[PDB]
């Protein structure tokens, strides 16, 4: 039944007595469900330590991973160039999933095409598919560049992207001078950040490898910035703002902040902003190249150091206070531009916020997950805030990254109870937060289910989630936030302290039971 | 049902999306392994809003992502030993699962992996129903092949598990809801009306579906098929083998719901017809009030829709019930900017990927695949929500603020 | 004889192209192709003759667009396409199997190319 | 008892069995508390409509007001000028309370002095107190100008500020040329916004009244901006950013955004930034004066239109979409500078965020309170979002403001169920949200006690609070947010939609009970 | 810090004051009879950013506000009641708005009409509306603000008439802010109101069953639960805490106070007058107890048990033995990270001398203290409890105190919210010694752990080591 004045959606329409009775009849008559006591016993078992040892012995099963495949990162990298169409040579379902993922995260149109590789291409390869796809993509969407990645099927059957694109150019499907950079992105190797690295290295190769005889380092007196796989629109803008304040000439390679923030004015823009081809072609002339996320920009670092002859600085991600300071000092040293008073005032304001919120932030226990560079920057910031990261999980991390994070933790008194997990999924983190309960988790929307599980054990065992990472699906416009630099540090600090304060307010809202601590001033 | 042109921004899914994401995924008591690399399961994790009741992680696993997470060594040397070890670990860690379905991704069919043999061996060893589905994404041209392959897997592995069993107490009013995926609770809103008519919904799959309901489906007296495109194969197979008549029902809008209820009641005795008339009389004032409230603010607005296989042609009735104009067997029952400008549609209904494009173009939009995170939209209870969402989207002031006043 | 027929079945909904081919090799009905054949009677008469000799009591239609002609030593032999209508795949007769295109891996290049041309004609 | 490994603060230390038993013994032995059934019955009575009729019949009792006294606003206005000391002639407890209030809101040092008028000044006035206070303030803190307001005591005893300051300068306590503007701020008239208006009018009069002979309107080609009582630093910064983007010369009079956000660098700065005396002296030379909050700047408007001969535009507060557009067009017309493409892109992005979250914001019912201009701007934005502001409360509003808000509501289909209350306190709002339950209430921290009350009736009756206004005490660093312009509109929209989403997630986190709607994508 | 250096610092900081201001301030800064050294409870210099409050703050916000079952009216304009609403963390147990009214603001909201024509009729109508809308209140208190005493309003007659009519205890407290120089006169006025209107309400009543172990906690305002943490220790000792006001206090407990056998006075400054009055009238001995720190808690518990029979002393020994391992573990964990740190304090009337115990229990040394509104007796008690060659400041100004801290350069500072952010900017770790920085309790064995944890959290926080930009 529905009331026209108080129309109810699925919640709480399905909480009505008639719906409850119908569902109970369905469960008790035909579902053959396990007894509720049995379900409760099994759930209680899954929250114990014996289940934790059984879960951590897993070697072939992955439950709720915290990573994606390479072509997603390749598409994100391709979206950062001016009038560039991402083109994934392979099956079309992969492209549909990439577009759905990025649409749900950014809430923006996402452009990506496929050659619809089918059983015919499974038997004979996708040469004809590549030719037809390139021709149709150039004729239909009018791109200035087509950036080609691969899916799992193309990498498995062994499709040579270079030969296919060369044959397409030779047979007249696309002009010989049309830029078609390519990158092999096997979905079974690495994660989406590896795909971003492969796509960026392929584009840089295509634009700079064969024209290095007239490039002199420091000619244009600019600094190349490679942001890596970044899904925060504010992170692209904070770097540009800080570099412009410093008076530093820069070239933000693969800048997708414009195409992912297109204004709604009654007109649809497929392309908006992005790195120009001239910036890529003039990139080797820069003073140096700074990688914002060095722990997944390894192939890019090798190409830049080997071909462009750039002494890439050993900088961590500009996340937090110390690392942002080091990034600013290195930029000043490379460019020769002194750090302005505005940046010093911003750093002082960040330190002021830290001092204001230290009484609430100190001693808090966090279980965080995400990408390697983002996770390590968040760990560094938490250590600077006096917080205690207890479960550092990175599904797409390696042993060198784990050693670096362990070295960072050992340099702080607050990393004593910290364990770094690599290759472990979110089902491992569920057991970790059930056995060794932290105060909060920090991660993407996929952690919202873990908080559902802990609350099932009890309100005292609930671990609230803080949505900092990728992808965030259950909240709106969080992709516009900043995590890099002083501005990102203030945003993260405000989010953390305010989440702690909402938790304290909720725990102390019981009248005559816990409301003595429901303080107005906190 | 032909190949899509390469190099175009088509939104067509794969066979894996049509099998794992549509037909097998909503089954709650079973664990579905996305056999292959990690991307496919991750992008499909909790994507579709196929609602269900259960304790997730204990006895229900709809919103969970079980995957093999293929690496380079699993591609070079195959993933059959990995599949067996994964099945053993699934049994160890999730003892309350009532079945396992191995949905193949693209590399599985290309590296020469025999998941059927592994499924047979492990099912014989563990006395468990393991269903190997060869839903490799490159197979076919869209998700329709995924639907066909998943239906074949259901028929060959799950449907005949109780053929020799005759311990189920059957009644002359036994119906099974097929093809309803409980998007926002549509299947529940249909089942409440069906059970209020005196019918017993023995099986409701895959939305909020269980393996026991699938096994009990061949024991029903009528098969009410919501989505013909994805379950026509299984409906025809059940009609040919078990002799169970099947009919299509449409519960979108009050007129279509009333007509479908009367048609369904016409298949039973006079008691069911009398109960159907009583139910229609009971629900008449509610949808009449909904129309009286929302038709004035929706009359005359024009509609275009472009959805996957079923909703493009069965949603018209609710639109006309609100006073709104709408402008190979699926086509038998514009049929695909300047054209949009010439007709000036007030609303377009399609998926998420085209949703933002048409939002940028300025046309009010409605997600016809996930109900725009709302619902249910079917039945008398869902008609109110559908009308409310129509008014919310079409008459929102945000669509009247696209042009800056100084331009 | 002089004609060859490629026997296929495509689902109207899912567009599943299955091929009814002999289990002893080849891709063509009723007999295998001559060894030297390379890519270079009414077609309905050929279809009805194949239906009679193979005891096919189904609804077979002729895809007139798919015309191919190969050369065997001393003879130019047309080969045509016969599609099986309906909605259900019939049980394969003796000595024949209902394969898919990806199941043609390991078979020679000639018959794989023939199946690829059939697939392009029908689905592509 | 405490465990050194896990030390508990008041919550949940006082939830232990020994503390519970001790408190129970205290209550049952000596408190003579009413029976719990009686307390529950009275609480249930307070949530009924009969209690609402009794509550709205109040004539002399005010419970939980939503306003402050004039000298607080006077101090806030004084803090916005260069090297200016707020000086409140009267008792010292008033100054202590003002400083504590602003310290708890801004979490910053707030400078304010008093002459500490006592019983002796109750019979002879505070002439000697004023002289000594001015001399000590100038000698100790070395301000460039002292802005004098009054407390209730000085207004009741009738202390002539002009005569007192003239005698102080004449008798040799401060230099004759030292700037000492004054304003009478009777705490029994109006609220803090009235005090801000009085203080600004006094400063403008002191600096411009006797030097209007050499002033020509539009000589300096600049626009004066009077922000009024503003407690958001982002509000001060967004206006300056938007006016600089247009290339419009402006003079932000009473700009305290620098002294209220001083960096922490080991040095305490008493003064930072602010409006210079030259800017105030050259203010009558501006093209026009724009009042950001015209509904509490009426005296300032009268002075500017009468003395400066400025045709002050009839502009609403630049809150939301339409009013921000009107403010931008008016500024463009006055200055002659066209609106740049960056502002158009910002407006388009705001409209895009409006369209993205319209499915979650439409039809939501809000009970909001605060200052008149802020409340009406929030109401306009809510109407633009499709929300229903069912309960609009403004303790310091008047009849004309109520008429204006009613005219705004009647112009939109979503103001049908909206009622505007003026002169009503937060107990009236408690009765309203109990009898006519809204989905959320927007206001300062003082609403956190209403929500608790609603939670005492039941989880189905709880009205969550969104903290937008002044003062916010239970959250950290929210004073850095923005409510003006497109940026403020996006921040408010994000806050509202995300609050709705957290409420929905919390309501659907019950395992096997309501988790069917615990959607990953929202 | 050498004593001569302290004198030189005082002279240098007073060098910039005017002659009258300098000569007045020179008597309020001293180096460790009060009159020979420090002058206290005097007028504050105009225009010097005083931290002192008003009589209304010391009466409504301190003594009367914490009483939960009573409704307290801020008679006058809106600001005074608005700024003091829920400012103090005087914890209580009750249903707010039904039977407890601590965090709610009752005011008459004086307008120009009420100033011109008085507010006695408005007060009577307000009392009627209070009785109508809040029927479960056990009493009404009318706290006067500054305009009340200047417009010739007779609130005593209104209180008497309405109390006789409604059979309710209405207490008029003439706590006008201009009265006196600080909150000490507010304390005195509130104590006089308690004595004259509430304390004697049960003098002719003999229906309370008394025991030889009856004690009353006076002057403990339950800041973060301090009074509860003291009361648990007192009751574990075998004593029955009949009355506990103002913190978590009820009017019935105030009326029952004259029936106790001992008065344990925590805050001497605010509740010494009432203790002396009760000793003189009812013959109830009163003693001061200090539960801040383990050593002070143990000494106070032993002293309190010494006032009763042998069973109470044996129970005190048992309680000390029970709580010994917990505070010993707290000291063992937190003293290593807090040993040798120097502290300076500027607090109100009682805490500056009371808190020196736990700081020494944690290995810290206090090198400077002061008061906002203390009297000569408070400083007489303070000098014995502080070290030599230290700085004592009475009603210190902003400039004086910043220069003092810039010269001593300590490791930690405990003062109010108004100097908290100043000293946070100057780079010195700060602890709110008034509201416990939204933490607590700090009194008793349970509160000592929280105190040590907070000291370690703030003093050793990394935020204080990042104040210099690495490029400067
Ligand atoms: Fe601060």
Numbering used by the authors:
A (entry chain D), D (entry chain B): 2 to 523
B (entry chain C): 49 to 375, 384 to 389, 399 to 401, 410 to 480
C (entry chain E): 1 to 40, 49 to 132
E (entry chain A): 4 to 35, 41 to 480
Quote the original article.
The active site FeMo-cofactor contains a [7Fe:1Mo:9S:1C] metallocluster coordinated with an R-homocitrate (HCA) molecule.
Further data collection and classification of a subset of MoFeΔNifV particles resulted in a 2.71 Å overall resolution map with a protruding density that we hypothesized belonged to an endogenous binding partner pulled down with MoFeΔNifV during purification. A partial model built into this additional density was cross-referenced against Alpha Fold-predicted models of proteins identified in purified MoFeΔNifV samples by proteomic analysis. This approach revealed that the AlphaFold model of an uncharacterized protein of 15 kDa, a product of the Avin_01560 gene on the nif operon, matched the extended density. The binding site for this protein on MoFeΔNifV partially overlaps with that of the nitrogenase Fe-protein in the MoFe-protein:Fe-protein ADP-AlF4- stabilized complex and buries approximately ~1,400 Å2 surface area (PDB 1N2C38).
